[PDB]
């Protein structure tokens with residue numbers, strides 16, 4: 654997250670921290686995700702595509718810090734890693750950038766809700782807020798494009814939804830953005846998602862309910878003028894989510 658503020662898991666209790674075990678046993682942070690039911694985390698296929706083996710991954714719920722345990726956190730194996738078979742990626746745009754992780758603890762349990770572990774509602778089909786709506790994004794990604802390190806503390810920021818029309822413009826992304834993507838950005842381009850935030854949630858309030866409108870997916874750089882963050886338009890993937898859960 655470029656700009657924004659530090660937070661704890663109490664303020665995004667559906668947020669999933671997904672890590673990969675390297676051959677040799679070392680564990681590095683991969684991507685965010687969102688708990689959509691006790692046994693299901695939703696994330697981005699791009700996060701997993703190079704290392705598609707479910708056994709290499711660890712999912713935490715209730716976790717506020719990158720490399721330190723949060724009190725109350727729960728640790729899961731991935732019992733099913735479902736990538737989108739229509740996934741495609743060019744130099745920038747990621748298409749069908751959506752992934753499902755069925756989670757299972759060593760004791761064979763799904764998430765148990767708590768002050769720090771809750772599910773997020775999916776949108777109603779094709780039901781998205783209007784352009785200019787303020788939404789939140791959460792993650793452990795870079796605080797600056799030039800950073801090497803990821804922050805140790807979870808971050809959140811607010812971005813505003815951009816129309817398909819505005820996002821299609823020349824000096825934006827042209828035809829790189831489709832109706833199955835949502836663009837969001839700051840009016841001053843001062844806050845954004847960045848490397849390590851992908852897979853993570855874009856949450857909007859829809860008819861007074863906190864809703865997973867988006868999945869952090871792609872962008873040209875981070876917090877660049879005329880280069881908004883691009884999100885998987887969750888409301889356009891309900892049949893795929895339904896058929897895989």
Ligand SMILES: *C(=O)c1ccc(NC(=N)N)cc1
Nearest residue numbers: 846847848849851871872882
């Ligand atoms: C994901 O890791 C990801 C998503 C989006 C960006 N870029 C922007 N939001 N501009 C970088 C990395």
